[PDB]
Design a protein around this nucleic acid. Structure first.
Length: 111
RNA sequence: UGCCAUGUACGUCGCACUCAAUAGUCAGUUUUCUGUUUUUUUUUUUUUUUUUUUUUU
């Protein structure tokens, strides 16, 4: 979380890095942890920084894709939408412009 | 360039400035706050914090 030393994990749960880590003082924007433990709060024991272009290919059965702002763009002759990819409610890509016309064939033929 | 008949009618007069003072009507319980200057600046960005536990050709 921005300017906050707490992490949004799976579902609405929030956690923090176990203080014995070396990156406990160096927080990443995107972290993966080994053990979730509830003692005083939620703690991920062994933590490591990740790059969020990683988790779409390896969670294909878990990704939910939400497409907003379907607008027909002339230059492609095709409809664009902003896609958001999430697992467990975690917004992996906040915004990616993608071809809504290539996604669905039903209405884009008429358009 | 000589002459022009007689008698025949008159008087006196007036004008102005104005006008003041007046009726009757007694009284209203005690006590009270309300009140004044003076330093003026009110307001300035922050952070990472703990650990049941035990076994795998």
């Amino acid at each position: 979380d921005a300017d906050k030393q707490e992490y949004t994990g799976a579902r609405n749960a929030r956690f923090s890095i176990f203080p014995g880590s070396g990156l406990f003082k160096k927080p990443p924007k995107w972290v993966m942890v080994a053990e979730l433990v509830e003692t005083s709060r939620l703690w991920g024991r062994i933590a490591a920084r990740i790059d969020p272009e990683w988790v779409e290919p390896v969670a294909q059965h878990l990704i939910k894709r939400t497409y907003s702002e379907p607008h027909w763009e002339r230059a492609q002759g095709a409809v664009m939408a902003t896609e958001k990819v999430t697992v467990y409610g975690l917004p992996i890509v906040a915004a990616r412009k993608v071809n809504y016309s290539q996604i669905d064939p039903a209405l884009c033929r008429e358009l």
